[PDB]
């Protein structure tokens, strides 16, 4: 021995590697998650209570933890040491939720909002410069505690100015909206039934213009939509299909509390919506009566946490009822990852989850006060 | 769904969907039409809940005939996915039944909800 139909026989002959390299691949593979553990954040300074809430700083490399120890333990996360830059004890102020905040216009402004089962709320600007929000300006009846709250950005269209807003849960379907800095009561939103959760999405209008819409859901699963730029008027109504005993609602794929923006142009709309509940389903909706794209049925207890990746490719759902009740779902395939978590993966009773704005870190707190860290090698 | 009559309204659905979950917890609930059929034969059911959106609706319309004969209150709910969900199953449920137990811990709520149902009837 010594087109063209035989092209396949040649290319097969050349290479014994036929798998396309995932380095060029930009969205993560469907079922295989390349995840490696890093040392826990709190090893430098352990927490004496559970990790009720967790939050990554929008730009700086800082991680904030709080809990019933009444301390705002903030750690400089580097993945190799994780030392404690500072802490802040707040006597008589149990910490149920805490979060970083940066003014969307004034990047220099940095503030911390922390709240609990109390009729007052603490703000910490960036000795400690601290402020107590304790006045509701005649709406004290609607509100019994500041324990559950979130911070969003509101654009004053008639002046084009943008400022932060503090959102609270009322006793009977009420949502109280307060000024982030002045603390003034701006608007209020009410729903039928017991308010269980609410979440925020941003819809850009044009260059420099955006509107904020309040998403509120009842335990029965009926969801309201209020326009906070128009005195909190309802703009839409729809129901979650097969929803009963709802517990949490979250949006993903755009700007949110977990993935805040640094300038107006960075405002993006969320394409995903997940609804948690007591029995454990997570109905996922494509924001682009509706019909859920998928009805996840893995976690067998109440959904205590729902969170989407900064790019909206991974949805993380956790339950505090039992140990290791933590799963990661690939989007939009809606398929749960199988390789991780494993039986030997240490999670305990998951109570808090946080995604870094960039770098692909996973941080998970548990009842034992341990914040365990992981790296997604794909990011 | 014209054959579906009477059909519970949004508010009336809430407490009946509320009771079944408690009954589901306390082993006071049956799931499935044939068990809902069989419990009527025993006469051990407070009332039977059905889904109006089941296709074909004739599958569950036999139970009202049994319920009327046995003087058992019954009600219809718009969505089946919610019922099976509230029942606590991973599958849709078109029919359900509650155990007759005067010693139950949720007896008053079960008594409270039927009182709406014969008024519905």
């Amino acid at each position: 021995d010594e087109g063209d139909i035989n092209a396949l026989t040649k290319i097969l002959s050349t290479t014994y590697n036929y798998k396309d390299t995932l380095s060029n691949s930009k969205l993560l593979p469907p079922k295989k998650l390349d995840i490696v553990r890093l040392k826990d954040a709190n090893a430098s300074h352990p927490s004496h209570s559970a990790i009720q809430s967790l939050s990554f700083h929008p730009s700086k490399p800082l991680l904030l933890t709080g809990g019933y120890d009444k301390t705002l333990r903030i750690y400089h996360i580097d993945g190799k040491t994780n030392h404690l830059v500072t802490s802040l004890h707040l006597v008589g102020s149990p910490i149920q939720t805490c979060t970083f905040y940066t003014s969307l216009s004034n990047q220099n402004q940095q503030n911390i909002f922390t709240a609990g089962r109390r009729r007052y709320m603490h703000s910490w600007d960036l000795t400690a410069k601290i402020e107590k929000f304790s006045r509701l300006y005649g709406h004290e009846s609607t509100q019994r505690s500041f324990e559950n709250f979130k911070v969003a950005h509101l654009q004053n269209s008639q002046t084009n100015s943008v400022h932060g807003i503090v959102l609270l849960q009322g006793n009977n379907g009420w949502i109280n909206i307060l000024h982030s800095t002045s603390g003034l009561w701006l608007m209020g939103c009410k729903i039928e039934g017991v308010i269980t959760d609410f979440c925020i999405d941003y819809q850009p209008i044009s260059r420099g213009k955006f509107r904020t819409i309040l998403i509120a859901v009842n335990a029965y699963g009926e969801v309201w939509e209020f326009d906070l730029n128009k005195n909190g008027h309802v703009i839409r109504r729809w129901k979650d299909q097969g929803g009963v005993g709802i517990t949490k609602i979250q949006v993903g794929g755009g700007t949110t509390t977990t993935c805040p923006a640094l300038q107006i142009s960075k405002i993006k709309q969320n394409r995903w919506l997940a609804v948690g509940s007591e029995s454990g389903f997570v109905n996922l909706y494509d924001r682009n009566t509706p019909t859920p794209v998928a009805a996840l049925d893995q976690l067998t207890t109440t959904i205590s946490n729902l969170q989407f990746s900064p790019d909206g490719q991974i949805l993380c759902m956790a339950s505090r009822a039992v140990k290791d009740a933590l799963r990661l779902v690939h989007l939009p395939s809606c398929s749960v990852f199988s390789n991780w978590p494993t039986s030997g993966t240490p999670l305990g009773k998951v109570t808090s989850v946080a995604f870094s704005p960039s770098g692909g870190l996973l941080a998970v707190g548990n009842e034992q006060g341990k914040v365990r860290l992981w790296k997604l090698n794909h990011y | 769904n014209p054959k579906a009559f009477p059909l519970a309204d949004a508010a009336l659905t809430q407490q009946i969907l509320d009771v079944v979950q408690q009954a589901a917890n306390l082993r006071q609930l049956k799931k499935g039409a044939n068990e809902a059929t069989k419990t009527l034969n025993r006469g051990i059911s407070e009332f039977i809940i059905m889904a109006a959106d089941c296709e074909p609706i004739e599958i569950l319309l036999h139970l009202p005939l049994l319920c009327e004969d046995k003087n058992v209150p019954y009600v219809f709910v718009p969505s089946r996915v919610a019922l099976g969900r509230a029942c606590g199953v991973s599958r849709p449920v078109i029919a359900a039944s509650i155990t007759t137990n005067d010693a139950s811990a949720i007896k008053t709520q079960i008594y409270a909800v039927k009182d709406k149902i014969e008024t519905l009837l």
Partner: peptide, 12 residues
């Protein structure tokens, strides 16, 4: 069953 008293476990 789980039978912790029955533990709250969704029936897959």
């Amino acid at each position: 069953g789980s039978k912790k008293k029955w533990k709250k476990q969704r029936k897959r």
